[PDB]
């Protein structure tokens, strides 16, 4: 009994699209600069709901007009998925971001929309309000970037106490901040934004070491990869990105060990078979 | 009765490939610097027709030989499509361009070629014969580019009387002229080439205000999009690129209004179901 | 900053990617000096070419600090000028971070991965037309 909700944020309020409507969310997240994506195929829309949603989702009013100083320029939508049995719920949060693309995939008799949301699509920000530090340490540049983007930060790396001269004075917008933080020191320590938290950590270290996820049931088989172990699983509302995993396989006994998560491929369909999440993991140090 | 013709231009003359042969033309046009594309799969070619066409289509005689000073270097082919009933024809023109690629997709017993043409594939032109202006206005640079390319021009923009110091003396060939005109002033005013007419205008303005196309019948449903309205229709020989459209929908009442065209996707199959044109449109100002 | 018929053909996204990758490729622009000291030859610099947004507004670039200033010297025979705040010139960009090279003046690694940015570069002074040449010195250095 999968329970999947797509919650928009609109001037009227939140209009939650439940799992009764045919919905299909393909989220793909990674420990990269690039904004994590979520494609949303939603069918069964009424005329009123289509008017209330698609008309608000637009790329105008910031190009041929002005109507922009803060948020409400583009609609922010979150995704809450999970399971529910015996009356209890498991609705976690799996994506927060603003819509960028909107098309239609299925014509009548089932008018189904397909939107494309991206995390931190508010690169329509205020062109960097506070100037970046002139000479400062890496953790301090990270703190400035987090404060500029408005997100709380988790910075855990061994490169924090390294000074930089002009760390990002060429930055043009807030989104480019993450690009700069990713650009400097990129063999291991890659920074990203997971939902509302900006994470800057080494690629071989776990963000929350006490939050290891012991994994014993898999769909298919936990197989090797040129980096670590890769495996698909049924939706567990406790697996984030950059988290620690404690794979204990049966089919492949050599893949057992502790791994950190680098990528994540959510594929959630209320009215269809795919309700999986795919994990790319690398050896954890 | 759909009537679709592919008319080549070769030294012998025009050899019209009619709709009796299995022809499938996918044309994709847009208001960009990019050359609009036409992929046409033609089956039922005789040996003689294959030798008369494919042998002429080549990328040699301009790389390992000379045989070149003007046209006849590459075969220019036009596409004329439409409907016909009660004896009256509706054959308009939907593409003019030179072939670039030749292949076969379907092996025997149906030897069917697949050839790829782009508009203005004469980019290996006379390496800019007339020098670009030293200091001039945008309209006059556009006129110089149109004169160099040999195409008549439609320049309708509010940036015409803006002087440019030094407009495009880094241009190497005739094709890069369009890329340059596109490069300067590119929030809205994007220049393109439709058939043999070079259009330079603002993106929110129509080439011919008196030539709005009232649309009432669609295939599927006219849906919203990021910019404007997107919709598919049966082939109407009155819809061009960047033309004005007057969408009047039934399923979606909110998409009614006047739109300009940005992208066009012709898919014409004489002996198959797809005979539609897909229109991307944005609000018209 | 985008166009509607992008996201339709692959080459549309590809050339948009090329444009955005070449827009961040900082090489050289005119610039002005806000601070300078002749003892260390490093100047705080404000670039003189604005960024422009969608609404057609100029957002001023950020001041760049500790930019080495050229001196055109070899064998110790350098040339100096009274670099004061307000003079204009041209600022360049380094292929890699030269912050670690600046303090050492020797073979050093790039401190960070920032490639082709105005954060690290030079500033060659240039007076442009702001001078007067006597008629007697027509063909004369």
């Amino acid at each position: 009994k999968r329970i999947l909700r797509v919650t928009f944020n609109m001037p009227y309020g939140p209009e939650v699209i439940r799992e009764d409507l045919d919905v299909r969310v393909r989220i793909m997240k990674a420990a990269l600069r690039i904004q994590n994506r979520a494609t949303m195929e939603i069918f069964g829309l009424t005329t009123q709901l289509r008017e209330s949603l698609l008309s608000q989702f637009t790329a105008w009013k910031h190009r041929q007009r002005q109507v922009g100083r803060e948020d409400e320029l583009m609609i922010k939508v979150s995704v809450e998925a999970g399971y529910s049995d015996q009356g209890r719920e498991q609705v976690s949060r799996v994506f927060v971001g603003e819509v960028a693309i909107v098309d239609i995939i299925s014509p009548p008799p089932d008018i189904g929309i397909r939107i494309q949301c991206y995390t931190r699509q508010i690169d329509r920000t205020k062109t960097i309000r506070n100037m970046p530090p002139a000479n400062t340490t890496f953790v301090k540049f990270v703190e400035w970037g987090a404060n500029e983007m408005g997100l709380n930060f988790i910075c855990d790396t061994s490169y924090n106490d390294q000074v930089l001269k002009n760390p990002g004075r060429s930055i043009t917008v807030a989104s480019a901040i993450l690009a700069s933080i990713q650009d400097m020191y990129m063999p291991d320590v890659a920074a990203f934004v997971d939902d509302d938290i900006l994470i800057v950590k080494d690629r071989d270290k776990v963000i929350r070491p006490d939050e290891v996820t012991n994994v014993n049931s898999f769909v298919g088989i936990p197989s090797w990869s040129e980096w670590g172990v890769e495996f698909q699983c049924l939706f567990e509302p406790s697996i984030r990105v950059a988290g620690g995993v404690a794979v204990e396989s049966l089919m492949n006994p050599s893949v057992n060990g502790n791994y950190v998560i680098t990528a994540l491929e959510y594929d959630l369909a209320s009215r269809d078979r795919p309700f999986y999440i795919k994990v790319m993991g690398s050896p954890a140090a | 009765k759909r009537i679709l013709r592919v008319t080549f231009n070769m030294p012998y003359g025009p050899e019209v490939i009619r709709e009796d042969l299995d022809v499938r033309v996918r044309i994709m046009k847009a208001a960009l610097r990019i050359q609009n594309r036409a992929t046409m799969e033609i089956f039922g070619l005789t040996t003689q027709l294959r030798e008369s066409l494919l042998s002429q289509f080549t990328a040699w005689k301009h790389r390992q030989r000379q045989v070149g000073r003007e046209d006849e270097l590459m075969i220019k082919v036009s596409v004329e499509a439409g409907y016909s009933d009660q004896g009256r024809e509706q054959v308009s023109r939907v593409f003019v361009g030179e072939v670039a690629i030749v292949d076969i997709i379907s092996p025997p017993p149906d030897i069917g070629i697949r050839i790829q043409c782009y508009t203005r594939q004469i980019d290996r032109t006379k390496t800019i014969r007339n020098m670009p202006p030293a200091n001039t206005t945008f309209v006059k640079f556009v006129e110089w580019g149109a004169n160099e390319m040999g195409l008549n021009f439609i320049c309708d923009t509010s940036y015409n009387d803006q002087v440019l110091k030094n407009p495009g003396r880094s241009i190497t060939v005739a094709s890069a002229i369009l890329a340059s005109i596109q490069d300067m002033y590119m929030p809205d005013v994007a220049a393109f080439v439709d058939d043999d007419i070079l259009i330079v205008k603002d993106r929110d303005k129509v080439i011919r205000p008196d030539e709005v196309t009232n649309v009432n019948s669609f295939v599927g449903i006219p849906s919203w999009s990021e910019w404007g309205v997107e919709f598919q229709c049966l082939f109407e020989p009155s819809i061009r690129v960047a033309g004005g459209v007057a969408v009047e929908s039934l399923m979606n009442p909110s998409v009614n209004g006047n739109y300009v065209i940005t992208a066009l996707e012709y898919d014409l199959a004489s002996r198959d179901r797809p005979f539609y044109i897909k229109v991307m449109g944005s609000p018209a100002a | 900053s985008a166009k509607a018929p992008d996201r339709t053909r692959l080459i549309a996204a590809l050339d948009a990617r090329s444009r955005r990758d070449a827009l961040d490729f900082e090489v050289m622009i005119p610039a002005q000096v806000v601070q300078y000291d002749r003892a260390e030859n490093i100047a705080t610099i404000q670039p003189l070419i604005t960024w422009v947004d969608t609404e057609h507004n100029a957002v001023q670039r950020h001041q760049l600090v500790d930019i080495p200033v050229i001196s055109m010297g070899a064998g110790g025979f350098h040339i100096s000028f009274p670099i004061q705040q307000g003079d204009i010139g041209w600022i360049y960009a380094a292929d890699r971070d030269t912050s670690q090279f600046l303090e050492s003046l020797s073979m050093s690694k790039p401190n960070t991965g920032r490639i082709h940015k105005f954060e690290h570069g030079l500033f060659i002074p240039d007076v442009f037309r702001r001078y007067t040449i006597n008629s007697e010195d027509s063909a004369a250095m």
């Binding site: 904004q35 062109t127 917008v173 | 590119m186 | 053909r9 422009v52 969608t54």
Partner: peptide, 19 residues
């Protein structure tokens, strides 16, 4: 999918500053 990859490619080339 080709279309989703194309749209993702188009996304990261849109910031306010034209040039």
């Amino acid at each position: 999918q080709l279309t989703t990859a194309i749209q993702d490619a188009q996304n990261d080339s849109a910031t306010k500053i034209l040039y």
